Every structure is written in C-alpha cells, then in structure tokens.
Design a protein around this motif. Structure first.
Motif, PDB file in Angstrom:
ATOM      1  N   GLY A   1       0.751  -1.072   0.012  1.00 22.90           N
ATOM      2  CA  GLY A   1       0.164   0.581  -0.395  1.00 22.90           C
ATOM      3  C   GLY A   1       0.671   1.367   0.102  1.00 22.90           C
ATOM      4  O   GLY A   1       1.624   1.464  -0.560  1.00 22.90           O
ATOM      5  N   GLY A   2       0.595   2.181   0.690  1.00 23.21           N
ATOM      6  CA  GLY A   2       1.304   3.762   0.613  1.00 23.21           C
ATOM      7  C   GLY A   2       2.829   2.948   0.938  1.00 23.21           C
ATOM      8  O   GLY A   2       3.677   3.128   0.361  1.00 23.21           O
ATOM      9  N   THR A   3       2.496   3.438   2.133  1.00 24.22           N
ATOM     10  CA  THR A   3       3.993   2.855   3.140  1.00 24.22           C
ATOM     11  C   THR A   3       4.276   1.381   2.950  1.00 24.22           C
ATOM     12  O   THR A   3       3.874   1.150   4.051  1.00 24.22           O
ATOM     13  CB  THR A   3       4.115   3.491   4.369  1.00 24.22           C
ATOM     14  N   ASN A   4       5.272   1.055   2.176  1.00 27.02           N
ATOM     15  CA  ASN A   4       5.533  -0.313   2.547  1.00 27.02           C
ATOM     16  C   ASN A   4       6.858  -0.569   3.799  1.00 27.02           C
ATOM     17  O   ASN A   4       7.846  -0.632   4.062  1.00 27.02           O
ATOM     18  CB  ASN A   4       6.617  -0.415   1.571  1.00 27.02           C
ATOM     19  N   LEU A   5       5.553  -0.863   5.099  1.00 31.02           N
ATOM     20  CA  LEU A   5       6.825  -1.124   6.220  1.00 31.02           C
ATOM     21  C   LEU A   5       8.199   0.347   6.483  1.00 31.02           C
ATOM     22  O   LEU A   5       7.790   1.632   5.568  1.00 31.02           O
ATOM     23  CB  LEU A   5       7.185  -1.912   6.541  1.00 31.02           C
ATOM     24  N   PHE A   6       8.616   0.038   7.380  1.00 30.98           N
ATOM     25  CA  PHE A   6      10.036   1.180   7.796  1.00 30.98           C
ATOM     26  C   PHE A   6      11.223   0.785   6.270  1.00 30.98           C
ATOM     27  O   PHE A   6      12.116   1.401   5.916  1.00 30.98           O
ATOM     28  CB  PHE A   6      10.674   0.067   8.923  1.00 30.98           C
ATOM     29  N   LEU A   7      10.797  -0.499   5.272  1.00 27.51           N
ATOM     30  CA  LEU A   7      11.811  -0.964   3.994  1.00 27.51           C
ATOM     31  C   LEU A   7      11.686   0.948   3.581  1.00 27.51           C
ATOM     32  O   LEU A   7      12.785   1.092   2.983  1.00 27.51           O
ATOM     33  CB  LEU A   7      10.714  -1.459   3.847  1.00 27.51           C
ATOM     34  N   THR A   8      10.029   1.334   3.351  1.00 31.39           N
ATOM     35  CA  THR A   8      10.459   2.689   2.719  1.00 31.39           C
ATOM     36  C   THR A   8      11.097   3.679   2.993  1.00 31.39           C
ATOM     37  O   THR A   8      12.073   4.311   2.807  1.00 31.39           O
ATOM     38  CB  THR A   8       9.492   3.456   3.063  1.00 31.39           C
ATOM     39  N   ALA A   9      12.304   3.406   4.348  1.00 34.53           N
ATOM     40  CA  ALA A   9      13.136   4.368   4.773  1.00 34.53           C
ATOM     41  C   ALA A   9      14.230   4.373   4.222  1.00 34.53           C
ATOM     42  O   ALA A   9      15.100   5.029   4.208  1.00 34.53           O
ATOM     43  CB  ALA A   9      13.098   3.991   6.465  1.00 34.53           C
ATOM     44  N   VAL A  10      14.523   3.662   3.642  1.00 34.08           N
ATOM     45  CA  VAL A  10      15.786   3.090   2.758  1.00 34.08           C
ATOM     46  C   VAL A  10      16.037   3.647   1.783  1.00 34.08           C
ATOM     47  O   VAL A  10      16.722   4.973   1.681  1.00 34.08           O
ATOM     48  CB  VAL A  10      16.093   1.296   1.933  1.00 34.08           C
ATOM     49  N   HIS A  11      14.428   3.871   0.291  1.00 37.66           N
ATOM     50  CA  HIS A  11      15.087   5.209  -0.964  1.00 37.66           C
ATOM     51  C   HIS A  11      14.675   5.936  -0.102  1.00 37.66           C
ATOM     52  O   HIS A  11      15.038   7.813  -0.529  1.00 37.66           O
ATOM     53  CB  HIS A  11      13.818   4.817  -1.496  1.00 37.66           C
ATOM     54  N   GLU A  12      13.416   6.253   0.836  1.00 32.25           N
ATOM     55  CA  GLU A  12      13.022   7.907   1.743  1.00 32.25           C
ATOM     56  C   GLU A  12      14.794   8.267   1.974  1.00 32.25           C
ATOM     57  O   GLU A  12      14.803   9.088   1.215  1.00 32.25           O
ATOM     58  CB  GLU A  12      12.229   7.521   2.991  1.00 32.25           C
TER      59      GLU A  12
END
Length: 152
Positions: A97-108
């Motif tokens: 969905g929107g935010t793919n868990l904390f994983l998004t932090a990597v790219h973010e």
C-alpha cells in the motif's frame, strides 16, 4: 573514522526493540554503501538528524503533512547533513500500500542521506518508492555508489 547514527522520534507502532532493529536496517543499507559507521551515541545531534513536521507548522508556516512534497529534498551537504521525515502523506500501511513498512525508509532517507537519483527503470533506481519484501530486502548496483562518498 567513526560516525554517529540514530533515529529521533520512535514511531509508536511496535516494540521499541523490535522496530529498533527494523529502522536500523534502513540506515544499514545506506551505511554499508557509504564510507561511515553506526555506533551507540547519545541524543545530541551528529551527522544525521531525524527531523519531522506534521500537524502544526513545524518551526514555521509550511505544513509537511500532505501539502508540499512526497519525500524530503536536498542531499548531504549545505541543506543539513541529512534529515528524512517519515509519515506525512503516506502513513504506515500494508506492505502493498502507501508506506511499505519501515522498508520505505531505505529509499525515503535516500533523499536526505544521499542523492543517488539515477532514475533507472526496471529497478528501484527510479525516483519513486519501489516495493520490496523485507525478506528479500537488498539494494542493487549503482545505488551502492550513488551514496558512497557523496559531497566529499
């Protein structure tokens, strides 16, 4: 040559120790791909500063929570060492969905920490967040150097 690594504002979702190891991964992938290190350091700001802006205009009128840009801009240098604000116009939702868990932090955080845009199709190189199973979590070539020795 040791560097400080920390994550201000602990997202009240799961166990501190549980999420601690998760959020750490984000900085890990970016650390192992850059000339630096992450050690236990007290909260006093150093190298990286986790800044957030929601609800009330943080600092000054602006409002980051849905009313500016998807991910933070500027890279390592001039515009602060590297501040990555999470949860603003996506919120922690299902992995698909929107935010793919904390994983998004990597790219973010990739925007603040570094700036390896690349914009290469058929991969995460793209400027947009690319889904990725926490199990198969890993970064491909290019991106590894896109941050290594940035603005140095």
């Amino acid at each position: 040559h040791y560097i400080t690594y920390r994550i201000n504002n602990y997202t009240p979702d799961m166990n501190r120790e549980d999420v601690d190891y998760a959020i750490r991964k984000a900085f890990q992938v970016w650390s192992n791909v850059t000339p630096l290190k992450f050690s236990k350091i007290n909260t006093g700001m150093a190298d990286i500063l986790v800044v957030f802006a929601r609800g009330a205009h943080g600092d000054d009128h602006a409002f980051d929570g849905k009313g500016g840009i998807l991910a933070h801009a500027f890279g390592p240098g001039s515009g602060i060492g590297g501040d990555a604000h999470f949860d603003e116009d996506e919120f922690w939702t299902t992995h698909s969905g929107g935010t793919n868990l904390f994983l998004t932090a990597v790219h973010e955080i990739g925007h603040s920490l570094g700036l390896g845009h690349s914009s290469d199709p058929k991969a995460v190189m793209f400027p947009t967040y690319k889904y990725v199973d926490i199990n198969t979590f890993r970064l491909s070539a290019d991106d590894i150097r896109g941050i290594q020795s940035l603005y140095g």
